[PDB]
Design a protein around this ligand. Sequence first.
Ligand SMILES: [Mn+2]
Length: 442
Amino acid sequence: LIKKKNKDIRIIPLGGVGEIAKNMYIVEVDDEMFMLDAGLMFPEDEMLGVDIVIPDIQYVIENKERLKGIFLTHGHEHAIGAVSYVLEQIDAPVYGSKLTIALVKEAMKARNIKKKVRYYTVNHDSIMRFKNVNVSFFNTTHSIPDSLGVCIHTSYGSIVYTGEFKFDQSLHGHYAPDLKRMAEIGDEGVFALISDSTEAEKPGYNTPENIIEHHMYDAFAKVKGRLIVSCYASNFVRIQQVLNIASQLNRKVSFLGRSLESSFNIARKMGYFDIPKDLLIPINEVENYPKNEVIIIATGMQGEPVEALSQMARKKHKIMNIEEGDSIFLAITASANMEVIIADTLNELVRAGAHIIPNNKKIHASSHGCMEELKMMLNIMKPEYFVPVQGEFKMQIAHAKLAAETGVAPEKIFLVEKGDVISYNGKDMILNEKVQSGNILI
Ligand SMILES: [Mn+2]
């Protein structure tokens, strides 16, 4: 519900536009400022070495007095990766789901930041109140559980930020969408919608996750020897899928040494995963079992999951190496930037004499909605104004075209770069100002 009659609305992207951010979107209602997400970016191609890129928050610092909070949609590193670095320079309350807050806390622990932080755990029923506006939330479907959309209630209508999202008819736990809550927000009136454009260029729909799990099952069932599956640590659904399959094929699961990935292990201890007892075994205990009774999972982030298999195929891995008659499956989705290292690794896999489980080319796997899924969000929301984010310029354009198709006025669709300022007086929406933005390498 709306608290007061508002005057000024400003929307500023400091990350996540013209790039696969590294998400950070600043929303201002009158004298109050809100930051939606704070992601990092891994440097793209170029030269391999440096670890991370974060947004320039100089505009936020100059107006730190007005920052009422930081709102985090999900626990991925493109959403919460730069939070610690923001919290060093500014002190603001952090809002997120139960899992997201846990993952942020771990990030602060890992950087040995002992500074006290005000954490507020939110859910789809939470309604956070401020001087000028009320903020509500709704569940979204993503590769990680407890992802939320943010709804800022103003007199002009709702400012909605989707975060990264999808629409899958097979995911229905803490991955479930809030169709009712979304529909309500739409009917009460959405002033401006800020949505994910990552897969805006791909027509149609994502392949439903259950179809993917089924095809993995049928493929894994044929494996007579050892099986090694490569995954992103970010993709909890794919991880949950192989755990299900291993249980059904009476195999047991082992992660690469020497311990477990932090995000996975936090979510596991909070009960987000469905894991039978003694399904997981330590990597040192793998030799005790016959080759056909183990599934080894290689997880990573930057693109190592592929690199790890290269190190295994080429007898150079510090923990475990590939032996002839081993089976390999890539449970990932390949960026054009990683087409080359997959091709090289596959070759080395074949030279080691490993069986390559082929990826179904009819399958399109993504954490982000395709054209029709994005139009789905647009049809439910029915925004007056649209601001496509989370994509390169070509991706943003594609998302804009989708919006126009759903009935959003072309005049009211805005394509922006980092530092651009979208302002609303009460009559006209204008892009007339530009603030400090950029990339900070770390
Ligand atoms: Mn994500």
